[PDB]
């Protein structure tokens, strides 16, 4: 149908906008602490602690399969990255501190993305 196509065009534009958001968020992690999943070879107990692991590469695979229906789903995944880190790592660690920073700096980008998603429909 013509409708399904219009729908698919919006998802594709949402995907385009979310890709730009994702690159902006990931620039706020210049150390690449959140780039890749936590290694289960190197942290074998990790899933005893964290039930829903997340990272920027895993978000990117989902993004490119157009797997985010709306900004809210994307934000959920970004928040997992931050929240998992803040639980698994103690406060006085480079990792925890890196999450605090990504959260604070990401909020600006996420604020505008919400306005652009509402604005452009």
């Amino acid at each position: 149908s013509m409708e399904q196509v219009a729908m698919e065009l919006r998802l594709t534009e949402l995907t385009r906008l979310l890709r730009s958001v994702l690159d902006q968020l990931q620039d706020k992690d210049p150390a690449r602490i959140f780039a890749q999943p936590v290694s289960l070879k190197e942290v074998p107990d990790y899933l005893d602690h964290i039930k829903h692991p997340m990272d920027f590469a895993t978000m990117r695979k989902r993004l490119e399969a157009q797997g985010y229906k709306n900004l809210h789903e994307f934000e959920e995944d970004f928040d997992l990255i931050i929240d998992n880190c803040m639980k698994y790592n103690a406060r006085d660690t480079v990792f925890y501190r890196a999450a605090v920073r990504l959260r604070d700096q990401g909020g600006v980008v996420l604020r505008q993305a919400r306005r652009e998603v509402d604005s452009i429909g």
Side-chain angles (χ1 to χ4, degrees), residues 1-2 4-6 8 11-15 17-40 42-60 62-68 70-110 112-119 121:
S1 80
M2 202 38 254
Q4 288 304 330
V5 171
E8 290 158 354
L11 181 57
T12 289
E13 285 309 312
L14 174 68
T15 302
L17 182 155
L18 293 183
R19 182 181 303 115
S20 167
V21 176
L22 183 64
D23 294 338
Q24 283 175 75
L25 293 178
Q26 191 158 21
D27 289 331
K28 306 314 176 153
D29 172 29
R32 301 195 63 91
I33 291 168
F34 310 102
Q36 294 294 325
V38 177
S39 184
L40 307 172
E42 303 171 4
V43 190
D45 77 341
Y46 186 65
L47 305 180
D48 297 344
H49 294 267
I50 296 295
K51 296 310 173 177
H52 297 107
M54 199 39 63
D55 67 270
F56 285 134
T58 305
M59 285 188 69
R60 206 171 286 283
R62 182 169 166 189
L63 181 58
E64 292 305 335
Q66 300 186 341
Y68 295 115
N70 54 54
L71 191 52
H72 180 82
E73 294 188 334
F74 181 93
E75 287 175 300
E76 285 191 340
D77 270 357
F78 178 64
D79 287 335
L80 275 176
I81 294 174
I82 295 311
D83 290 343
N84 289 342
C85 185
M86 290 174 80
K87 291 164 186 64
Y88 187 78
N89 303 103
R91 199 143 53 242
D92 71 343
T93 61
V94 64
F95 308 106
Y96 183 115
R97 288 159 175 288
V100 164
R101 290 164 62 81
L102 180 57
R103 189 193 62 190
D104 289 354
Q105 299 201 272
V108 186
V109 174
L110 289 173
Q112 207 48 41
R114 166 52 64 199
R115 296 192 61 85
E116 283 173 349
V117 157
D118 289 1
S119 178

